[PDB]
């Protein structure tokens, strides 16, 4: 299968046979698409609220957690939010691939492109 980020490696699209990195690519695709970006499905995507005061800053975290849970059933997701200094809201998505029982390292990460 072709993992989300389209990269031409060795003259062809990066095709992987390991489902863990394909699931990680699915997570990246879901997080990289804002609701309304796609014309076929304008409801697929995370909801983005950028310029607003940090009072209900856990509601969007919960919504993103729910969206990740519904979209990707092959992984378990826990999303946490932290408040940084200037204007940064740090989201941390903890995901585990239910197919495997241990953390799976990918050899494309160490490769430099």
């Amino acid at each position: 299968m072709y993992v989300y980020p389209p990269r031409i490696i060795n003259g062809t699209l990066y095709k992987s046979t390991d489902l863990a990195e394909y699931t990680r690519g699915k997570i990246l695709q879901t997080l990289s698409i804002v609701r309304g970006e796609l014309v076929a499905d304008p409801f697929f995507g995370v909801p983005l609220r950028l310029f607003s005061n940090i009072n209900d800053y856990q509601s969007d975290v919960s919504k993103i957690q729910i969206i990740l849970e519904e979209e990707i059933t092959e992984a378990q997701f826990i999303v946490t939010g932290d408040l940084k200094n200037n204007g940064i809201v740090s989201l941390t998505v903890y995901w585990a691939y239910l197919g495997t029982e241990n953390i799976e390292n990918f050899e494309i990460d160490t490769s430099n492109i």
Binding site: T17, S111, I113
Partner: protein
């Protein structure tokens, strides 16, 4: 008959039946069937060990079948082939001595994911600026099949070594084989057959010669090519080369080197070039003005090129003027009035059984209902 089943359907049923047997043998005196009983751990351990033994027996029968395929049939079972390529090492100077690249030299692509190793020692001779050697992938799988010039990164520099690349694309990389592919590959071995008739004798020759070429097999035709003098155990082959010309001696020799190990005992195989008879056509036809003159000429030319294609011609058969008329008329936009083949309006018989027709010239004389006349002469020789 049907294939027997090697594994037991239910091993708990086996334990149970061995305990029913403990009762049967002792004449209704051994009536404990639970794990706390004396016999149950022994029976369960035997059943488990037997399940392992029967699983190994199933594996052994499968492996025995595969070994029969590999040794007797000659069909190896493909459990994954490591892709191989042809690396070229290019030096930066002409060394006075031999440059030795040791075995298992590791090269990789840009990402570092794919790694190939040289299968042997590369010995670039003195005064040679480059040398080639085969390399094999680090692992099985189709992912190692890459195009040329993608395997060039080597982490261990050698002095005077300028570049390392793969001139060939890496191929033959597979992750395994389904049972159906192995079965069809085994069955293809049984189907192997030697040519015995004229038709398959011709097909074997045409496969070697190439697409666009023809052959003709004649029985009992001697070297002198005299029909009235039959020669027992002789199969004359007449070949028309891939370009439509009679086969040159190189073609004769390469066909003979392929067919000689296929003739059986008591048979003499003769190979000779075929003959060509040139067909010159003159045509007077009336157009219906549904097409232009040039379109009609081009369509007739293409139709006759197809009709006189060597594959569509049976050598030694007469060229029927009716068939040429039908081939021209099948274009549709015309109506033939006069057709002359080699200055005659009759069928052209061939001098011998090994002559194929080849049309080389056509004279178009087309007319419409308006009386406009289009004249042309097309020479179709190569």
């Amino acid at each position: 008959l049907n294939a027997p089943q090697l594994v037991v359907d239910d091993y708990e049923q086996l334990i149970i039946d061995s305990l029913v047997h403990t009762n049967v043998v002792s004449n209704g005196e051994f009536t404990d069937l639970d794990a706390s009983g004396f016999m149950r751990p022994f029976a369960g351990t035997m059943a488990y060990a037997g399940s392992e033994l029967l699983y190994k027996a199933n594996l052994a029968s499968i492996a025995a079948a595969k070994s029969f395929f590999k040794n007797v049939l000659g069909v190896p079972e493909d459990t994954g082939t490591k892709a191989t390529t042809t690396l070229q090492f290019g030096l930066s100077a002409s060394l006075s001595t031999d440059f030795i690249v040791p075995i298992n030299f590791q090269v990789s692509d840009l990402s570092g994911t794919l790694r190939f190793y040289t299968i042997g020692n590369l010995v670039i001779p003195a005064g040679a600026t480059f040398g080639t050697i085969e390399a094999i992938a680090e692992d099985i799988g189709e992912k190692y099949n890459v195009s040329a010039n993608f395997i060039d990164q080597y982490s261990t520099p050698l002095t005077y070594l300028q570049y390392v690349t793969n001139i060939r694309p890496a191929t033959n990389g597979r992750s395994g084989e389904t049972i159906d592919n192995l079965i069809e590959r085994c069955a293809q071995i049984i189907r192997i057959r030697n040519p015995v008739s004229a038709l398959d004798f011709e097909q074997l020759a045409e496969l070697t010669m190439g697409e666009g070429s023809r052959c003709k097999a004649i029985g009992l035709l001697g070297i002198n090519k005299i029909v009235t003098d039959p020669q027992p155990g002789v199969v004359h082959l007449f070949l028309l080369d891939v370009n439509g010309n009679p086969a040159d001696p190189v073609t004769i020799s390469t066909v003979g080197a392929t067919l000689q190990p296929r003739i059986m005992l008591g048979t003499r195989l003769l190979i000779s070039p075929m003959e060509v008879l040139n067909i010159e056509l003159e045509l007077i036809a009336l157009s219906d003005s549904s097409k232009t003159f040039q379109q009609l000429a081009d369509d007739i030319l293409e139709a006759l090129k197809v009709f006189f294609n060597p594959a569509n011609l049976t050598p030694g058969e007469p060229v029927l003027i009716e068939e040429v008329k039908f081939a021209i008329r099948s274009v549709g936009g015309l109506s033939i009035s006069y057709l002359q083949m080699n200055d005659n309006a009759i069928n052209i018989p061939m001098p011998n059984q090994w002559t194929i027709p080849r049309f080389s010239y056509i004279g178009f004389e087309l007319t419409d209902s308006e009386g406009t006349v289009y004249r042309d002469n097309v020479v179709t020789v190569t």
